[PDB]
Amino acid sequence: VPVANFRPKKPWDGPWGIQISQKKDRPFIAMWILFPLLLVDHLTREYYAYWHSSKVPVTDVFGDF
Amino acid sequence: MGGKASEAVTIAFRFPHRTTFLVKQNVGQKLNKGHQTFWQLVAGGWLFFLLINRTSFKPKLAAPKV
Amino acid sequence: SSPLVPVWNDLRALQVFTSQEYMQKRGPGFTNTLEYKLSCLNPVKWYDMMKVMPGGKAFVGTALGLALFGGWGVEFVKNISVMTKEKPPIDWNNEKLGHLTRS
Amino acid sequence: TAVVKNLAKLPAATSQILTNVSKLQTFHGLLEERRDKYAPLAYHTYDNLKQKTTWHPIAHAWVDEGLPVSKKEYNEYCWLKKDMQRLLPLASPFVFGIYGILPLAVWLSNDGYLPSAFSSKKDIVSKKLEWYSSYGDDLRQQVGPMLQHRLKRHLRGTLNNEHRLMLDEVTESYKEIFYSHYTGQLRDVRKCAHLRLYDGTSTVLLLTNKEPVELTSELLQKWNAIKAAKLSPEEEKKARNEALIEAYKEQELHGGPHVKHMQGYGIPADTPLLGENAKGDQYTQPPESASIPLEQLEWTGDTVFIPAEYRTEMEDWGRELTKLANQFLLLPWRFVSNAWNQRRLVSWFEEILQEDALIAKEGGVQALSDDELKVALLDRAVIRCDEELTRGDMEARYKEISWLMSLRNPFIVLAWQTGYYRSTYSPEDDLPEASILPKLNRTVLDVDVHNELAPDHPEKPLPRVHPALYPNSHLALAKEVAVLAK
Amino acid sequence: DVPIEKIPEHANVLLKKIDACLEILSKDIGEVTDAEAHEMYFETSKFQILHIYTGCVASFPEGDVPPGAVECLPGQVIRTKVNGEDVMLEIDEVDPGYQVCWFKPDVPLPENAEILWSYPYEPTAALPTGTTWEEGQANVLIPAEPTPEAAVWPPTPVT
Amino acid sequence: MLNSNIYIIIYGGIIMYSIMIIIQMFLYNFSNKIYIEVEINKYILSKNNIDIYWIICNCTIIIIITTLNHIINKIGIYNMIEYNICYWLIGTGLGLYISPFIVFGYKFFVYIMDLNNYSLNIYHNNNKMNDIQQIYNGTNYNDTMIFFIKDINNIFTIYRSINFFMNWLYQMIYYGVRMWLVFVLHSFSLGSFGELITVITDNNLIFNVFYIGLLGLGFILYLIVIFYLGIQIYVYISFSLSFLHSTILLFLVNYIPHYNNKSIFNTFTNKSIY
Amino acid sequence: PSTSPADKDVPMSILHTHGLSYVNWCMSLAPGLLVFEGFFRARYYRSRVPPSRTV
Amino acid sequence: LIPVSLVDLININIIFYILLLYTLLLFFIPLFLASINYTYHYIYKYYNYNYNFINNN
């Protein structure tokens, strides 16, 4: 006879603890990919308008134009 | 500008009364209910009101007679 | 807030307790008067005594008062600073433009 | 799949659905015909904020003691009410359109969403047991613990305010009720009843032609004695009014009713005379009934129940705790106010009490079968189908929750019920090992209800005394002894 | 169906189980001693680390410093080899009216100096030997670590 | 064409600058949690404490993070965001303004809709005529011929109900504007002094030297900036919460004394009598 | 529609930069990072003491 | 000065900043809640029901 208040795991018991850890440390991993991307996005950037600029960069979002 | 809670009564001062469940002995008051055909006539009057206020869409009036 | 708050509280208590004193003085018999019999058929009294009822009836009464009369009140408040102002004549529509034969 | 498997029987199910609707209509007509002449009027009452109705079983859950109905017939009534609740997705095409058939497909996918007609079984007991073991125990087993936690955190409060909100005398009982899945020891229902110490004294004011009088055990005993004597009404009312004036004098000597000195309630004094209406020293104006002599004190037939639930009241529970209680009891909960879910809970409670009354009329629990008792305990939400208990344990569990629901308090009922739904899963396969002792067995005798139990002092818990060790236990338990030996 | 004599067998079984548990759980992991885990404790010292393998260390009264001597103030970390053991010495609470300095062989010692510990002459050696602290040269104190009484649960009496 | 109504949206560097603010919250890990716990338990006691607490935690930690990125991570928007009025009015003040209305919105709404039925509040209201006036006439006051002016009455009573919720908005706006002005004017004045000193030294190259020191001046200015802005942020938070207490949370003071129960093991019921 | 004009494409060279003053560089708060990186590293890695033997 | 401007009062760029910030906050709430308290360890370790037996003799 088995011990009481014990059972096998089920899908609604959620993920295991190791899986919760693997979920937690994904932002910490993407940090290493995004902070260099932040610095590159700032460094490889160019201003959009000048005193001589006859045009300004336009971005049609929905292709209506 | 404007008032404060310190200058006003509370949500416990207003609504200070807790709940009390009233009960009354049954003498037979909710017996021998009349007007057994009331809801039939009410539904009839409701449907009559809907019929007199009904208007079907007649697109044939837009036909190119000209 | 102002320091006149206790003054206004005294005046409110005065009018309230004097009205209650009046009701005590006149005593019973109000239901036999004509005022009560008209208030029984008066919609202002129905609305005013339904406001304080429970079941969201305070919200219902306030929102109904808003939807009915408070819009006109907002317009009135907007028009208080419009009544004194010079306005031009109304360009009344000639009701000639718009007619067109069907085809 | 199950979609086509249920579509195959969908034609054969409509006839059974309509037959069940006819049975429900007849049964409700009969029951309401009885209720409209024997039951009192429980008036609707609004919460402290006075915007939504509030409901309590003491006033609204009435038990027809003398209901000429079989227990299985009442089970059919309740189960078909739930089937009427489950038939609601049939309205989706009639409100959304021809594309409102995919909701009906989702409805027909799972058999647990469906009513009785889609089941192959015939007996109502086997059908209910199938539905539970397939869908209902699993749905309840994933709401039980989080409801237990919400009840805990409702008592102890949020954000580290236990020193301001909890009581230091109910502490050991609280621990035994909420942390018995740590020890593995059984629980005593009286320790769950100790949770009512958070509340005040529940009172019952009888309204008379002069003043309200607080009901007591003595007055109730006298009224039961007079009712049992079966006297003429001219003597019955006289004795009732004699006891009433006696109790009135008793409470007037006590210092008035308990309600006078309770925050949130109160009895007004005589009204004041304002200004010139004040006649010298008489600053008051007594009511009309002061003219009536005290010897003419008669009961109006009106009653006011006051639970005085300052921490337990269902109003203060919240949006989440009520929904989770209805999930745990397998009731409808979505997209409704807490007042409507309160009414649903009170109706379930009334059903369980009526079922208890009919079982007691039919000869208690022992007259029932094993499957019937299993289904009853599933309805009471004290058993999960992955336990396989004994008959004595099932009977003791039923007795426990029956006495606990006799007190008419959903909070302690849920606290008791949720303790039987704390199951764990091990990360290893070898562990837990196969036990060596037999299964846990009990009897109706092991439940101590006929004896009082004082609250254990904090950090000074006392052991559990069996009822048999008490004096005259063979005399007190003689009814249960005769029922078990027979 | 369970007599009372069969109970102590079950009790023996459970005692065996809990003893197999407690003999493991009685063990605990001590403090970490890996130098790679604590090298930054020395990196972050208020003074740079002295990799000392030559010369001598001497205590002499406070005042003028001999030119060429490396002061060893409180907080100074010194990587050395002592009796074949690579070690780090952290200076703590030098006595008053006195100071400690590393004197390379090129540096002449002053008067009234006391050689606390010295190194041998091994210029051709690739792996230096370091020092040899004899009994009486250095008083090394091992912590006592008095193991207190094992927490015993009170046995209740049975008449 | 006629139907084409065209609108221009000014879009810049938002995505990559906003991601790292949330990503830093795992590093900070709510260091202000203890302070806000202490303050909330000082100012209010209810079951819904945790809600408002969490809200305030989020707002405050966002403020702190933005401030530190404004001091250290100087790129693009992180410099302007504290010098801009929209951030100080909507990114910090609006959340704190709507937080109690989101936690205790039920009670406040019911209170307001009851205050539209304006009436005089009596302590120990054992009066009977008060009740008859409140039911029959609707109010203690005389409501004769106010329907004649009901159109204004509605809105005026509405303001009369929210007048004790309006100073919270006023204080939030005031302290947001204060923080904006503080940051902007102090930065501008400091930069102006720097530019005048550099003009003096460029015109006098005997002085165009690191006259205080390369690190001395920088460390001192770092300390000055961080100390001043820490004082200002502590002020804005402490005052926001103290005024939250004194303006909105004194409404919710409902102290219940503990009453001992006696009828634990027996309850009177409808079946006990009927 | 989407555009990518040539006005934004301009010559770039570090030689054309005006630069910063000594005061502006001190106000740039780089020297504070320079000090406080080492400060916080020292505090963190010095809070955790290792075992030792007292000589 | 530049920040003294009515254009910077309802700046849509900062409104987008706030939008993206709090959408990401909402996405990452269940990871912020993943800190462990050791209170139930204490309750398990220190909760000791009365284990004494009844003995009439």
Ligand SMILES: CCCCCCCCCCCCO[C@@H]1O[C@H](CO)[C@@H](O[C@H]2O[C@H](CO)[C@@H](O)[C@H](O)[C@H]2O)[C@H](O)[C@H]1O
């Ligand atoms: C206890 C001290 C009491 C005295 C208080 C003195 C006022 C101090 C105000 C501190 C706040 C000033 O805020 C600070 O302003 C400076 C000056 O623009 C900004 O500095 C920035 O702009 C300057 C202006 O040229 C650039 O040169 C510099 O490279 C850049 O960092 C800082 O990024 C900002 O943090």
